[PDB]
Amino acid sequence: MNINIVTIGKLKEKYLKQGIEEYTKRLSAYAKIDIIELPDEDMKIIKDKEGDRILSKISPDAHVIALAIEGKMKTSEELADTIDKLATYGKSKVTFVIGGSLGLSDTVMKRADEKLSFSKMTFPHQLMRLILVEQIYRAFRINRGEPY
Template identity: 55%
Template sequence: MKITILAVGKVKEKFYSQAAAEYIKRLSRYCRLDVIEVADEKTPDGASDTVNRKIKDKEGERLLSHIKDGMYVIALAIEGRQRSSEELADRLAELGLRGDSSLVFVIGGSLGLSESVMARADESLSFSRMTFPHQLMRVILLEQVYRGFRIMHGEPYHK
């Protein structure tokens, strides 16, 4: 299985980078993993809804340019479906069995994902109704994908 993490913005804090690198290393025994970062737009304080939409649209265009036909796209969004770790493992296994072997998880910037990215997504996934910094969300996603593979392979994992 090939998994791509497609994210707006770079991970700037060293501790997030180190955590992400550790999970990327651990995942290498289960799947091929790519992390693609696209540039984020500066969001002025007190920006209008129109300005915010334009920012999300620009970021969305950058994200969509990396999504190819045949890729199964899972958008991370607060309004997405919440799953337990076991349910995520089952979903990853199900997608692999039915031939969706190129998965893309999309993480938006500080304003979220554009309507065009959400329209392209095959499904959306929520880790919580809470908002997380997108840099931290990358680490959480990597950890949960790793946990999912451990569960799929019947290997122990921390509960």
């Protein structure tokens, strides 16, 4: 399959860039991974604009998973389950959406096939990216039946 992560803002701190580099390399063995890093920025007109800027990158064929706190908190086994089930049917494209400070436009949310929540806590989106990649790498390991 081929995974796409559409995020907001460019990674600043090097330790995160390196960490993501690593997992991306690892996940690369199980499927294709591409991280679309697009530029950022009462005032929801910016949220909405960013919302169309994201949709511009989303494939009509991709099963979209937007990261949001009002989302379903799946287990690692459940995220793995979801991906396996998508492979079972023709769903070879999976795209994850990580909003920015502002958040995600109602339009992006409407397009999303599902909302996933990683925690009740707040994490900087730079870090959320690193967690997300690792987690997807973990989902595939689970699915390939590897102990990890």
